[PDB]
Amino acid sequence: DIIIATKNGKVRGMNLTVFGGTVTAFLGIPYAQPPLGRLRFKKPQSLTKWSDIWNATKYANSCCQNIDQSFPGFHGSEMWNPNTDLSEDCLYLNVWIPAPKPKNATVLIWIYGGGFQTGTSSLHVYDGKFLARVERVIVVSMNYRVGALGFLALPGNPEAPGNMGLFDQQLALQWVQKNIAAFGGNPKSVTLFGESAGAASVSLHLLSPGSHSLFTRAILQSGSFNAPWAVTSLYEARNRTLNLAKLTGCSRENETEIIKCLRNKDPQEILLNEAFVVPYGTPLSVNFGPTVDGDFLTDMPDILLELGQFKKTQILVGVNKDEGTAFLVYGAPGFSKDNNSIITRKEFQEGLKIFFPGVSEFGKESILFHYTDWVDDQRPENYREALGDVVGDYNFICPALEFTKKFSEWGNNAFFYYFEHRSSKLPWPEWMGVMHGYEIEFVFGLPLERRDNYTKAEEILSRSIVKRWANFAKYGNPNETQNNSTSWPVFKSTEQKYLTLNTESTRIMTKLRAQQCRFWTSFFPKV
Amino acid sequence: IIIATKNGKVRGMNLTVFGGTVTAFLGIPYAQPPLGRLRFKKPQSLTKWSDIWNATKYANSCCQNIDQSFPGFHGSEMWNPNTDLSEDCLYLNVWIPAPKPKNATVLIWIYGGGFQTGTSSLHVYDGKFLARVERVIVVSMNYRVGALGFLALPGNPEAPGNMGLFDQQLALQWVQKNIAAFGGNPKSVTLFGESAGAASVSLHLLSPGSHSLFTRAILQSGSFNAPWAVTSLYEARNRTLNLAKLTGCSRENETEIIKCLRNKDPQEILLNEAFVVPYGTPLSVNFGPTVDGDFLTDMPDILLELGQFKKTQILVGVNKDEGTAFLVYGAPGFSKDNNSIITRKEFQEGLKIFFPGVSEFGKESILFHYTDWVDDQRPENYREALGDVVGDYNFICPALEFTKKFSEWGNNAFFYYFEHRSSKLPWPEWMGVMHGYEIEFVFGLPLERRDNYTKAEEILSRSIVKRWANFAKYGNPNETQNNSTSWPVFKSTEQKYLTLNTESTRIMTKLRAQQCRFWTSFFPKV
Ligand SMILES: CC[N+](C)(CC)CCC[n+]1c(-c2ccccc2)c2cc(N)ccc2c2ccc(N)cc21
Ligand SMILES: CC[N+](C)(CC)CCC[n+]1c(-c2ccccc2)c2cc(N)ccc2c2ccc(N)cc21
Ligand SMILES: *[C@@H]1O[C@H](CO)[C@@H](O[C@@H]2O[C@H](CO)[C@@H](O)[C@H](O)[C@H]2NC(C)=O)[C@H](O)[C@H]1NC(C)=O
Ligand SMILES: *[C@@H]1O[C@H](CO)[C@@H](O[C@@H]2O[C@H](CO)[C@@H](O)[C@H](O)[C@H]2NC(C)=O)[C@H](O)[C@H]1NC(C)=O
Ligand SMILES: *[C@@H]1O[C@H](CO)[C@@H](O[C@@H]2O[C@H](CO)[C@@H](O)[C@H](O)[C@H]2NC(C)=O)[C@H](O)[C@H]1NC(C)=O
Ligand SMILES: *[C@@H]1O[C@H](CO)[C@@H](O[C@@H]2O[C@H](CO)[C@@H](O)[C@H](O)[C@H]2NC(C)=O)[C@H](O)[C@H]1NC(C)=O
Ligand SMILES: *[C@@H]1O[C@H](CO)[C@@H](O)[C@H](O)[C@H]1NC(C)=O
Ligand SMILES: *[C@@H]1O[C@H](CO)[C@@H](O)[C@H](O)[C@H]1NC(C)=O
Ligand SMILES: *[C@@H]1O[C@H](CO)[C@@H](O)[C@H](O)[C@H]1NC(C)=O
Ligand SMILES: *[C@@H]1O[C@H](CO)[C@@H](O)[C@H](O)[C@H]1NC(C)=O
Ligand SMILES: *[C@@H]1O[C@H](CO)[C@@H](O)[C@H](O)[C@H]1NC(C)=O
Ligand SMILES: *[C@@H]1O[C@H](CO)[C@@H](O)[C@H](O)[C@H]1NC(C)=O
Ligand SMILES: *[C@@H]1O[C@H](CO)[C@@H](O)[C@H](O)[C@H]1NC(C)=O
Ligand SMILES: *[C@@H]1O[C@H](CO)[C@@H](O)[C@H](O)[C@H]1NC(C)=O
Ligand SMILES: [Cl-]
Ligand SMILES: [Cl-]
Ligand SMILES: [Cl-]
Ligand SMILES: [Cl-]
């Protein structure tokens, strides 16, 4: 029968017959205790033992979220929505093993995104039944406490220290370091890879000293800690704890007695509050995310990066072509799913204070002027393409580019990619192009299947990036093959080579958006 | 050779040039000397003279302050007057081809000097070559400049402002009533100036009074929409009162203020014009054009947009290093004897000297816009940046913006781009094609081979002479030859212009569109 003896107990999975083969999927193994009762809003502890054999054979609890229903019934909005009922006992992990059980297969651990408030491992696209078989590697998947339950930070106080959600991952990565050799995995060749908050969490694990021995390499897909939304300042994050307690009716006597009120009230009672906690919110506001807790993160991430106090390893970071367009349909004026969404001049201007509330009028006019240099004016699609690039470069494109530039300075091979392919089955309209988060379908090898109505060009592309994603994990270079493939050069600060991922042609280019990103580096900080 | 004018007879020289000869009349009076009572007032028309004027010598130059920054340097004193200074300076010079032509087209030169210096008597302004090779008539002028030519008390005819501009207008009116007897068509007259005549010719397109004195215009590195061209009537009246207390003359009425100012000797007025502006720029026009109500109905930018101007052909153009001539006159780190490599800080200090009143946030905006280098290693790059932020904002962008709005009313605008640096340029090489050195090639000085001008500088000067003259005659700059690029018109959409260099002249599109887009659409906010 199919059972593996953990250093922790016994768990069994299933047979998933894939592509005409088989994989071993142990899905929903706990790596910590149910964080309710006497232990929530705090870091997780190591789980003791179970005597009954654990049936780790169905998607465990998605951790509680504020479920997005701004457009009910639509696929693309309900696609990222958790596939499992919500609660606080949510600290499980999925792991798919290629069958037959391998010898020292390279391990990959996916960190889901969602802006440190949403997201869950149980989603259909975060799944590695493909990656496990096509390249014969082990794929691990985790669920961490998201929102105010894993990122409520009272600095120094153990009862709510901060970045507990990031500590869930550190414990989840510790489980794989303890007992994945029983599954057949190589605890020495372990690659992190995430997206939009996982890529941000992947980068934060390059900083945390407690994780310097728990993985080998990193892959950052449209995310990094130097993004303006990744880490919030300490005495602004500690504040949004006090206003939360002020919100739930808790008057202060000291700073410790208050936490016990935070615990008594209901789970969804407090997630109702993750929207009012920040008054000047914006569609890219992280109301409760990572911060400087002194234990997980010694200082602000930009300081440790500049001083070079991070894990010296090889990374694979890249962005998509139209990251910013996903955030315009959630509040920006004149932007809808069922339009073509043309805008005039100042709906871009007022489309700036929605994303830049605390910026001077000179700052917004500087943003407007720099993104107004038209190649063709009377082109009506100008201002909507401009606003998408404004949100895209400020939040994901440049933060990933300059991170690699600074990471490359310390002498480790880094590779950058630019995803320009729009999937045919993307349910959102065409004006949003290659949208944020819709490249992971290719990363997990979904087009590799013929029954999802994916065209042949996309599956050749999916098999291409799955091969290099896997090759980088085992070897350190995301090479395709030799004697028929386009070489992926290393990114370094002087030439800044990056690889394009599309169906037309995988090209080598230099200095991605160097003219645009210079604004957000050399001028906008001075505004 | 002797002739007769409408107010007497002049007696002119003869100039043996190019083997041929050309007749000159240097120092003809076109206005009564504005001395004593008549100073600060518009020029009064001249009277008959019983004598017969001998126009055989360059007349005196108007009272001005000498550029003594570099004593002994030919480059700084090339623009200093060669005649003795006096207020009796409203004279004009005419050059006429031999034999006397039938109806030769006339070209009137307006000298520059920031409305503070300059004269017709400079060697760079010698028209004896233009009249010989093209058989055209070139007429030079002398107009009052400085306080004695542009003192502005708006409304009061004792000092109404723009008298220097009226000195020009009276000199044009002299041409259309005398040049027919000289051998030229009065109704085919072309105006060409440089950097203050270019701004003056640009102003003659706006004044209804001068609509009848010329046919077409030629602007060289200057326009009325330049930021230094026209002073607002507010501050222009401060500079008048600032000049009063500097000369101990602050009194009740402006009748009494001009009385003492009219009684004080000229250099007591001249030596104090550097203090009328508290925030003095190397391009600070102490006393220039004003919105007086007589020459300019209102501010010039509103007349260009509304459309009450003389509709005709123009020929505008600038050079690629217009701004570097002003960097050695106050900008720190820049100097004439040194490769003027500056740091980033010396670039910011230079910005404060040329942009005193604008924001700090605005100074960082013009900084960041001009640091997208083609090559980051280039140490020269910060030096070249300051040279163009003051070249575009002052000369390049206003000139391009002038023809764009001028041509939009159905007129034929022709834009050039003088790229060649003269081999005889007495200033160092880091300044490139400097502001005001197109004039040597416009007047045809390199054609006399007794000077150290390369052959590549003659055929350039010889070219520029024909096109300038043909534009005066036929309305467009043709050059009669098969192998020479036909200069197309400048319009708002495609924006074609012709560069002028020694190797060959090619045409380009939308000169410095990226840089001026910052000065057109972003700088007026900061
Ligand atoms: C589009 C869904 N996603 C999970 C795809 C992988 C990416 C997360 C995007 N994403 C979403 C978001 C948008 C729509 C639906 C669900 C979540 C979001 C939603 C709210 N209220 C507040 C902040 C964010 C947010 C903040 C930072 C980053 N970096 C990404 C973010
Ligand atoms: C002398 C050379 N020039 C007449 C070219 C033919 C150009 C005049 C440049 N030029 C000069 C200047 C600079 C150095 C030496 C002499 C004059 C100048 C000097 C002072 N104090 C104040 C204003 C200006 C000025 C103002 C506006 C414009 N548009 C040009 C100007
Ligand atoms: C699979 O690979 C792992 C690691 O790649 C091997 O384990 C050890 O790897 C280290 C590298 O740091 C070597 O120094 C050791 O010599 C390796 N072990 C041995 C016994 O040689 C491992 O051997 C491979 N095979 C299995 C079954 O794990
Ligand atoms: C990509 O390049 C790596 C080298 O960086 C190749 O790695 C070698 O792979 C073979 C087995 O395929 C190993 O025996 C070698 O030890 C590897 N070399 C190393 C680790 O330096 C890799 O094969 C390349 N990818 C492909 C598809 O050929
Ligand atoms: C006309 O305006 C000028 C400036 O606009 C006045 O002169 C000076 O302005 C500077 C501006 O920084 C001040 O620092 C000085 O204090 C001003 N001068 C004096 C004497 O206070 C000028 O005063 C104005 N004209 C009149 C007649 O007052
Ligand atoms: C061409 O260059 C020569 C020097 O190489 C100049 O010669 C000088 O000319 C001046 C007249 O301006 C005389 O006073 C000097 O005595 C000459 N020097 C020598 C060494 O002969 C010549 O003048 C230049 N050409 C022109 C037209 O000025
Ligand atoms: C599961 O798959 C394995 C490998 O293909 C096979 O040997 C086994 O018979 C299958 N069924 C069970 C119940 O293990
Ligand atoms: C703290 O939160 C309160 C809530 O309104 C408010 O004073 C402000 O947003 C924060 N103050 C500081 C100093 O961060
Ligand atoms: C797009 O549809 C929205 C729906 O409310 C509307 O507000 C907007 O004006 C439309 N844009 C157009 C028609 O360009
Ligand atoms: C010189 O001027 C005289 C008039 O005095 C004229 O007759 C003659 O043609 C001119 N040119 C010469 C002599 O070459
Ligand atoms: C005026 O100059 C002319 C030039 O030949 C000559 O008659 C004489 O030098 C002057 N005439 C008188 C009357 O002084
Ligand atoms: C100006 O003031 C003086 C002061 O004595 C006076 O005599 C003169 O008549 C006044 N002029 C006018 C025009 O008001
Ligand atoms: C250039 O000359 C000026 C003249 O004072 C000087 O201040 C400046 O430092 C010089 N530049 C260099 C690099 O020496
Ligand atoms: C330039 O214009 C005139 C008048 O229209 C014409 O006679 C002459 O041939 C033209 N020159 C060229 C080169 O076309
Ligand atoms: Cl008035
Ligand atoms: Cl001015
Ligand atoms: Cl008064
Ligand atoms: Cl010849």
Q: Tell me, letter by letter, the H, E, C secondary structure of A102-124.
A: CCCEEEEEEECCCCCCCCCCCCC
The kind and range of the H/E element at A386 are helix A382-392
Q: How far is the CA of B447 from the centre of ligand 18 (A)?
A: 9
Backbone angles phi, psi at A373, to 5 degrees: -70, 85
* Closest Cα in chain A, distance from residue B350 (Å): 19
Ligand whose nearest atom lies closest to the CA of B335: 13
Quick check: CB of A401 below 6 Å from ligand 7? no
Residues 6+ apart with CB under 8 A from A32: A44, A45, A46, A47, A91, A168, A171
Alpha-carbon distance B112 to B95, whole Å? 20
Alpha-carbon distance A198 to A444, whole Å? 15
* Cβ-contact B213, B169 below 8 angstroms: yes
The catalytic residues of A are 196, 323, 436
Backbone angles phi, psi at B51, to 5 degrees: -70, 180
Alpha-carbon distance B515 to B526, whole Å? 16
Alpha-carbon distance B450 to B116, whole Å? 33
Q: By three-state DSSP, how is residue B261 classified?
A: helix
Residue of B nearest to A494 (CA): B376
* Cβ-contact B497, B508 below 8 angstroms: yes
Q: How many residues comprise chain A? A: 527
The kind and range of the H/E element at A97 are strand A92-98
Question: Which chain B positions have a beta carbon within 8 Å of A526's beta carbon?
Answer: 364
- The two most distant CA atoms of chain A are separated, in Å, by 71
Ligand whose nearest atom lies closest to the CA of B446: 6
Q: What is the CATH number of the domain that holds A401?
A: 3.40.50.1820
Cβ < 6 A, ligand 13 pocket? B 333, 335, 338, 340-341
Quick check: CB of B65 below 6 Å from ligand 2? no
The kind and range of the H/E element at A202 are helix A198-205
Give strand ranges (E) for A112-184: 138-142
Alpha-carbon distance B210 to B141, whole Å? 15
Q: How far is the CA of A100 from the centre of ligand 7 (A)?
A: 9
Quick check: CB of B241 below 6 Å from ligand 5? yes
Residue tagged active-site, from B76, B140, B195, B200: B195
* Closest Cα in chain B, distance from residue A303 (Å): 25
Is there a cis peptide before residue B99, judged by omega within 30 degrees of 0? yes
Decide if B522 and A362 are in contact by the 8 Å CB cutoff.
no
Is there a cis peptide before residue A100, judged by omega within 30 degrees of 0? yes
Q: Which residues surround ligand 16, an ion (CB under 5 A)?
A: B 231, 285
How buried is residue B379: exposed, middle or buried, by Cβ count under 10 Å (0-12/13-18/19+)? exposed
Q: How many whole angstroms from its chain centre is CA B114?
A: 7
- Best residue among B21, B25, B54, B100 to mutate for probing ligand 10's pocket (most ligand atoms within 8 Å of CB) is B21
Beta strand pairing status for A315-320 and A217-221?
parallel
The kind and range of the H/E element at A501 are strand A497-501
Closest residue to atom 14 of ligand 12, CA basis: B253
Q: Is the backbone of residue B146 left (phi > 0), alpha (psi -120 to 50) or beta?
A: left
Alpha-carbon distance A133 to B438, whole Å? 75
Ligand whose nearest atom lies closest to the CA of B467: 14
Closest by Cβ to B368, choosing from A362, A365, A522: A522
Question: Which atom of ligand 7 sits closest to the CA of residue A22?
Answer: 5
Q: By three-state DSSP, how is residue A264 classified?
A: helix
Question: Which atom of ligand 3 sits closest to the CA of residue A103?
Answer: 27
Residue of B nearest to A517 (CA): B372
Closest CA to B201 of B276, B290, B310: B310
Question: Which atom of ligand 3 sits closest to the CA of residue A181?
Answer: 28
Annotate B117-168 with three-state secondary structure: CCCCCCHHHCCCCHHHHHCCEEEEECCCCCHHHHCECCCCCCCECCHHHHHH
* Cβ-contact A59, A14 below 8 angstroms: no
Nominal resolution (angstroms): 3.0
Question: Which chain A positions have a beta carbon within 8 Å of B359's beta carbon?
Answer: 362
Interface list for chain A against chain B, based on CB atoms closer than 8 Å:
360, 362, 365-366, 369, 372-373, 515, 518-519, 522-523, 526-527
Q: Please report the sign of the dihedral spanned by the C-alpha atoms of residue A376, residue A377, residue A378, residue A384.
A: positive
Structure tokens of A344? 């005039």
Closest residue to atom 1 of ligand 7, CA basis: A15
Question: Which chain A positions have a beta carbon within 8 Å of B523's beta carbon?
Answer: none
Quick check: CB of B476 below 6 Å from ligand 5? no
Closest CA to B190 of B218, B156, B166: B218
Query: Given the structure tokens 């400020």, which residue do they identify?
Result: A394
Torsion, CA A61, CA A62, CA A68, CA A72, rounded to 10: -50
Q: How many whole angstroms from its chain centre is CA B75?
A: 18
User: Between the CA of residue B289 and those of B165, B230, B238, B257, B300, what are the distances in Å?
Assistant: 8, 5, 14, 21, 10
Closest residue to atom 7 of ligand 10, CA basis: B1
Alpha-carbon distance B224 to B288, whole Å? 11
Decide if B364 and A518 are in contact by the 8 Å CB cutoff.
no
DSSP B263-293: HS-HHHHHTTTTSS-SS--TT--SS-----S
The kind and range of the H/E element at A456 are helix A456-475
Q: Is the backbone of residue B149 left (phi > 0), alpha (psi -120 to 50) or beta?
A: alpha
Residue of A nearest to B517 (CA): A373
Beta strand pairing status for B10-16 and B21-29?
antiparallel
Question: Which chain B positions have a beta carbon within 8 Å of A515's beta carbon?
Answer: 372
* Cβ-contact A403, A203 below 8 angstroms: yes
* Cβ-contact B188, B473 below 8 angstroms: yes
Alpha-carbon distance A444 to A451, whole Å? 16
Q: By three-state DSSP, how is residue A324 classified?
A: helix
Q: How far is the CA of B298 from the centre of ligand 8 (A)?
A: 53
Q: Which residues of B298-313 are buried (b: 16+ CB within 10 A; e: fewer)?
A: eebeebbeeeebbebb
Structure tokens of A260? 């016990």
Residue tagged active-site, from B435, B438, B458, B463: B435
Alpha-carbon distance B203 to B290, whole Å? 11
* Cβ-contact B125, B140 below 8 angstroms: yes
Quick check: CB of B252 below 6 Å from ligand 12? yes
Q: How far is the CA of A340 from the centre of ligand 9 (A)?
A: 9
CB atoms inside a 10 Å sphere around CB A485: 13
* Cβ-contact B219, B399 below 8 angstroms: yes
Closest CA to A135 of A501, A449, A445, A454: A445
Number of domains in chain B: 1
CA-angle at A271, arms to A265 and A277, nearest 5°? 105
* Closest Cα in chain A, distance from residue B368 (Å): 7
Backbone angles phi, psi at B215, to 5 degrees: -105, -55
Residue of A nearest to B372 (CA): A515
Question: Which atom of ligand 13 sits closest to the CA of residue B335?
Answer: 2
Question: Which atom of ligand 8 sits closest to the CA of residue A236?
Answer: 14
Domain carrying residue B6: 1-526
What's the number of CA atoms in the CB half-sphere (13 Å) around residue A282? 17
Alpha-carbon distance B424 to B411, whole Å? 37
Q: How far is the CA of B90 from the centre of ligand 16 (A)?
A: 25
Question: Which chain A positions have a beta carbon within 8 Å of B513's beta carbon?
Answer: none
Amino acid (1-letter code) at residue B250: S
DSSP A417: E
